[PDB]
Design a protein around this ligand. Structure first.
Ligand code: HRY
Length: 126
């Protein structure tokens, strides 16, 4: 069973805007998580073939990852902060759906999520 195509990261016909919140989401929220010691499972789409997880995409129908988010912000794909916040939340939730409580990745996701929630709690006014 193969991997799906990655999520789209640009669309040349979408409108573009740069807002306070979108800047913060790339420069503060994504930056912080991306440079963290636990970012690496989350920096690219899950390759279920190379990572030997053949049921991954039987279970996870809305994949998401921070490499995709990073490119969506750099490309001005998002119009609203909430689109980006939703993507982060999808990413974390997928991890919690798929992986078992003993797995290190679960606690790594919990730690990153907590950082994420701190930074989103400080989302600058719109
Ligand atoms: C930090 N340094 C020391 C080592 C880094 N290398 C270890 C071997 N590599 C690796 N090893 C993955 N799984 C194996 C594994 C072994 C031990 C611990 C953990 Cl958390 C994961 C792995 C798992 C995933 C993965 C699996 C399920 C899932 O829901 N998500 C979101 C991500 C992604 C990349 C992955 N890279 C390439 C990177």
């Amino acid at each position: 069973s193969m991997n799906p195509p990655p999520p789209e990261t640009s669309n040349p016909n979408k409108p573009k805007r740069q807002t306070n919140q979108l800047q913060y989401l790339l420069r503060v929220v994504l930056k912080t998580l991306w440079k963290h010691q636990f970012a690496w499972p989350f920096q690219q789409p899950v390759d279920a073939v190379k990572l030997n997880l053949p049921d991954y995409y039987k279970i996870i129908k809305t994949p998401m990852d921070m490499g995709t988010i990073k490119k969506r912000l750099e490309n001005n794909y998002y119009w609203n902060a909430q689109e980006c916040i939703q993507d982060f939340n999808t990413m974390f939730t997928n991890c919690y759906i798929y992986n078992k409580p003993g797995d290190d990745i679960v606690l790594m996701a919990e730690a990153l999520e907590k950082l994420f929630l701190q930074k989103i709690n400080e989302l600058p006014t719109e």
